[PDB]
């Protein structure tokens, strides 16, 4: 289905860790579970919550970065383009 994507294995692991089920998802679902992952693992900066620190986390390996800012999502979107297989 054109509105779905298939996350590559390591990204799927992250989504499943946050409660997702299955192999195919809409982009909004991917974002929901990835956000839940960051929230429950409390990877965001407590004082400046737009900042996410993920050094040593599988999320950091996917990003190729120790941290990123939700205010400049480009690196996050780059990771999703590489890890979301589309039609």
């Amino acid at each position: 289905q054109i509105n779905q994507v298939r996350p590559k294995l390591p990204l799927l692991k992250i989504l499943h860790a946050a409660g997702a089920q299955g192999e195919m998802f809409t982009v909004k679902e991917v974002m929901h579970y990835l956000g839940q992952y960051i929230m429950v693992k409390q990877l965001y900066d407590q004082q400046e919550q737009h900042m996410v620190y993920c050094g040593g986390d599988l999320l950091g390996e996917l990003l190729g970065r120790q941290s990123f800012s939700v205010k400049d999502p480009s690196p996050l979107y780059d990771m999703l383009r590489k890890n979301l297989v589309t039609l």
Binding site: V27, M31, G35, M39, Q49, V52, V70, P73
Partner: peptide, 12 residues
């Protein structure tokens, strides 16, 4: 001011 507030902005 919260992670959720900023994160929600990434999707319409």
């Amino acid at each position: 001011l919260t992670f959720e507030h900023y994160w929600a902005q990434l999707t319409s």
